Amino acid sequence: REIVSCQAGQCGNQIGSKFWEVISDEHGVDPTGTYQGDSDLQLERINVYFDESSGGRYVPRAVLMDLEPGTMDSVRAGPYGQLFRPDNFIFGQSGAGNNWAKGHYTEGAELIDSVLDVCRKEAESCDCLQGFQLSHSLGGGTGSGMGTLLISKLREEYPDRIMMTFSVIPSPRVSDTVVEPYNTTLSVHQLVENSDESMCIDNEALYDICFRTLKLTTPTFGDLNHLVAAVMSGVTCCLRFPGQLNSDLRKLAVNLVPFPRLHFFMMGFAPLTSRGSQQYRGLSVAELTQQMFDAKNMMQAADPRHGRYLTASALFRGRMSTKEVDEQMLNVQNKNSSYFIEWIPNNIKSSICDIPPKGLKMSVTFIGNNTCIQEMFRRVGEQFTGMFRRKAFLHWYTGEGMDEMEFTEAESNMNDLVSEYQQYQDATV
Template identity: 35%
Template sequence: MKEIINIGIGNYGIQIANEFLEELCIDHDIGLDGVKKPLSEKDQQLDYPNIYFEELSSGKFISRSLLIDTDSTKIENVRSGKMRQLQSIDNYSCLKSGGSGNYAKARNAYEDGLIDSFQDKLRKLVEGCDKFQAFQVQYATGGGTGSGLGSKITEHLSAEYPGELVQTFNLLSNGKLQERSLETYNTVLGFNSLVQNVQSTVLFDNHSLFNLCQRQFKLPKPNIEDVNYLMTQYMTTITSAIRFPSKQINDFRKMATSTVPFPRMHFFIPSMANLAPRYTEEYEKDDMRTKDVCYRLFDARNTLLDVDFSKGRFYGYTAIFRGINYSTVDLIQALRKNQDSNSSYFAEWLPDHHAVGVISRDLKYLPKNQGILLGNSTCISQTLEKLVEDFTKLLRRKAYLTHFTEQGLDEMEFTEAESNLNDLISEFKPCNYYDGEHEEADDY
């Protein structure tokens, strides 16, 4: 069994990791006490809970996860929450002092007090695996703890486990610059570690998640639980190709290999088709046609990152479909037809750089047929350009710079971070369909 170790970093990363664990329990019929519902011998062969869970000698399951923070508040909430019996005491690592929304302070906290505790607990988790597959990491790039600790931890994973894949799910912040100045600094400073030490990164942004909740779930004022659920629903579906028998795709490395033409260009745009709010029966009899699901995956209105597919070209994509009514042949034909009719949005020198996974098992409390897309498109440069533009505005005025220099960060590190992000953007440019000088293309 190819095990995955799930790591939640900072306040937001811990929230997502904990809610993702709850969805896994529902998917695998594991109770909050760690006891799994008895299955027939046939069903047991089609269910792989040991990828994210460790089965104890007592028959109970606990998660293969590690939650790390510079503030003990969120971790104490998890320890006393409803998921507490699914976590071991070795699943936590924290300090008493907070990161205070500062990349430099969180990075110092890791080096001063968290490094030994984290490395020891991580080593035990890895040694407890029979056939280790990958690290799955979640954190918000704008948070001080997320960016600072996230950078140090991904550096450690790359150095200590060089042959293992690191898959991250990261939340970007957007909004008015004056409301997120420190978050902009944190994101750009921590982004270089995502480029150098990670093999696959899926980017979300809170604005797109919020809008999707309003539009798809008909929620006038979505709360943080609604937004988090949308992200964990995506993660649950994409990992179902690993946790259940799947045609063509059975691990994260296969997804990355199929869609990453160059090592540094491993940043993915997520989209979903046929969404449903949690615990609803509204979509229980949904019979959306295969071609409609495929079409909606490439609709900019269904992306979980604020980009426009029509202003870029796809290097490749991974599409995963989950439901009892899907035919692999029909899906491949529908995707091929969609690509042929929109050929200008795909890099012509990579005609078949994609992978398709089909899981013939519906999701509990979710639509009977659902699809998700992991897209590698040059239009992600739109997001990166906006980020570096905001960073440059702040840096030229040296606004809020003392918050970081007082923690030992040199001004040269800001300049290097800006340069590194500009280099990444320039790598996407040669194949970009839309460069701003031509007329805007029609909507996809």
């Protein structure tokens, strides 16, 4: 039932702040901490994400975590920054230096115990955890390195509990630093074994969504965080609200992970419409279905036509008939069997939740396991090979306590994950 969340780095901190934006809006939580909801359904299962205090205040079960102390001040100063606990603000004096080594071995190592203490305290406060969730970026120093260190420690302490990661995968079009290959390559080989499910977010895909779908003239990181927060709040909709077809966090893992090494997931949300054109579209389950499988709607930069869906899942929210919620899935499977995999008929998990997101009639979150998710790994591996063959930018990592062969091992198991996806892309019956 309870899911305990953590935010790593400034990217993860802002994404989590907007996620709590969305969650407090759904549950009617006053920024001052009181409950202002007009319905009992929101209050019935509010304990999933919120812990009540003696005075009735609701505090998120969130652990903020960043070596940079500057952005934690902005997170606290935000509209819902007053909602979090002060002791959940775990920060270091020095920054991560955009260095996986500095985050994972030197700076975060002396701080991972402190953050794990409060994570364990919140775990003990929860009577029965549904699992741990993390939001971070693989291209940074502290969001990637010591965030993955947190994932490792939490896996060591709670093997059974479900590990969500929401990892912002970098793209060349939004390549705003230089050590994306090193950081992402050193983070993925931790994410493969230490995470039960991973959600790949691509800034280029979010920007494309804003370009074409939402038609925002000058969208910002706030809008991107809103788009990702919608999905990471709807992923746990059935836990907090009743539905005709309920599901929990382990549902997606069990129904979408065929083999233990394939848990890098697709993206998706619906409806997504510009404010001008929202009046002219009839919001229907058919429109939702036609948007979930659209290439530009999914918010990671890899076209799904080149790949095949290992699995898929739709977490519909709102009062809709049970006919279409799976009739449309059957129809799309039948008419695009090539884009699906022959030896798994019924590729699509379906879940239905009664309460829709606030301000929206009906919604759906699309989470898939596709064979096109290895294209970003192709690109990152190519960049990493180019960088590593010339030993460029390697002294920064090796001075903090790394080794030459660690990069080779990260390359090797990146290639192994790539090959595992590739061979099932064209596997035959």
